[PDB]
């Protein structure tokens, strides 16, 4: 299991002060949001089980994200300075961080990475005690964060508060977070030539998002020949995916779709059944 | 809960 926060800060010179958006996830379930462009910005719930928290939870999260809005304004100014960039251009800082939970209920792995204009900028290393800077400007940040002991702060959070509250959320949302929804599956067939047809393997309504959809021909994986779409949200917190191969007419019986998902008791093997 | 306080880059 995991917890992640995703932050986006966007400058917009001439059209207001920088905008700050935060979203939080447990596994693939979004549970909170904050957007500084609201009239009176507040942290809001995005899954029902987080509403077991009291009003103080929402006020405190709102204080933190309001402060982040101001701090990222300063970060945007600092980075413009590092790169000698005009005040007239728009720029974006992104950050994603959080914890992966181990079998003993303690930290398995911690994560913290930031980006500038969609490119790697600085990352906390897996030892949670050192940084990887992507360029010369990020080495300015690195020296500042080394002096300020940011890595110690993040290590404590990732080993402590992060795992403590991830476990709390998993227990409070156990009935939805800790039950996998298996995919509903089928295979479709459509001619594309006198001599070729598409076989498409569908996986619908599954949770969590992690899944393996593979076509085999005579039991051999067809990875390089398989079109896989990006896993996509259904809108009801479950996911959808398909995988397609173009095959010679008359060979369809040689092809099997294999589905692996946490919700399935055993992996599925599917065939086209006209 | 998020990290309680962010540093400036």
């Amino acid at each position: 299991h995991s917890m992640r926060y995703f932050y986006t800060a966007m400058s917009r010179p001439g059209r207001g002060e920088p905008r700050f958006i935060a979203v939080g996830y447990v596994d693939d379930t979004q549970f909170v949001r904050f957007d500084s462009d609201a009239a009176s910005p507040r942290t809001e719930p995005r899954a029902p089980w987080i509403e077991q928290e009291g009003p103080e939870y929402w006020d405190r999260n709102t204080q933190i994200f309001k402060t982040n809005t101001q701090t990222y304004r300063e970060s945007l100014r600092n980075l413009r300075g590092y790169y000698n960039q005009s005040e007239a251009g728009s720029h974006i800082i992104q950050r994603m961080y959080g914890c992966d939970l181990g079998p003993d209920g303690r930290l398995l792995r911690g994560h913290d990475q930031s980006a500038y204009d969609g490119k790697d900028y600085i990352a906390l290393n897996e030892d949670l005690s050192s940084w990887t800077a992507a360029d010369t400007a990020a080495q300015i940040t690195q020296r500042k964060w080394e002096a300020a002991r940011v890595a110690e702060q993040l290590r404590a959070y990732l080993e402590g508060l992060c795992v403590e509250w991830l476990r709390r959320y998993l227990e409070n949302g156990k009935e939805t977070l800790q039950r996998a929804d298996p995919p509903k599956t089928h295979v479709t067939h459509h001619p594309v030539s006198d001599h070729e047809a598409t076989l498409r393997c569908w996986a619908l309504g599954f949770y969590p998002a992690e899944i393996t959809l593979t076509w085999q021909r005579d039991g051999e994986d067809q990875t390089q020949d398989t079109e896989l779409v990006e896993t996509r949200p259904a809108g009801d917190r479950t996911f959808q995916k398909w995988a397609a191969v173009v095959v010679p007419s008359g060979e369809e019986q040689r092809y099997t779709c294999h589905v692996q998902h946490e919700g399935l008791p055993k992996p599925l093997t599917l065939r086209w059944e006209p | 809960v998020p990290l309680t306080e962010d540093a400036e880059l």
Partner: T-cell receptor
Amino acid sequence: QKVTQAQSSVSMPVRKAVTLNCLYETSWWSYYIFWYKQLPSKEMIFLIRQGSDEQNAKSGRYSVNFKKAAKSVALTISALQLEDSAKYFCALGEGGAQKLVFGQGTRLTINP
Amino acid sequence: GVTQTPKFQVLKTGQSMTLQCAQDMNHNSMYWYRQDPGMGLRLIYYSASEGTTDKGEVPNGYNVSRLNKREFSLRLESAAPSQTSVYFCASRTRGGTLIEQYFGPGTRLTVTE
């Protein structure tokens, strides 16, 4: 008191150690404790910090025995010097705002 | 570090006075506290950055102004004897672990009738 120091005045010989007690209450999930000392000039001097997510703090002759479940954060000063005489304050900073809540302090007199 | 002026002040009841604070550490978070005799410090106002004062969070008898990144002022609008106190400004960095507040030298303020 939301932050309570148990002693109002303590005396101890040079070269010994002293422990100054501090208990606090909070419902915040993230906080810090700070120990300061105040000189006769009224100047306030930072000594040592204790984070709610960190192990027992140590800084030179200062250490904090952080008993988190008991919300106890006693300061111990080792190898006492005459220059350690001062009024010592325990302060709680909660969450992101860090609006410090102070104990009423303990006067420490180091005796030659 | 953090500077404050004046270090000492006497006022008559009803007089107004502006206390000045400045810090050169590139901090955003700044604070005003007061310390009565024999007591700890009590917060008057926390200024997280430049911006407009939240007057609903300013205690009666005071005006607070964050003038720029470095400078922070506390005014006693009509001094009362109950406002006799040592007024401390403080500032701190945000982020990392070294978030302890740095105090100015204080303004020792006595109000007499």
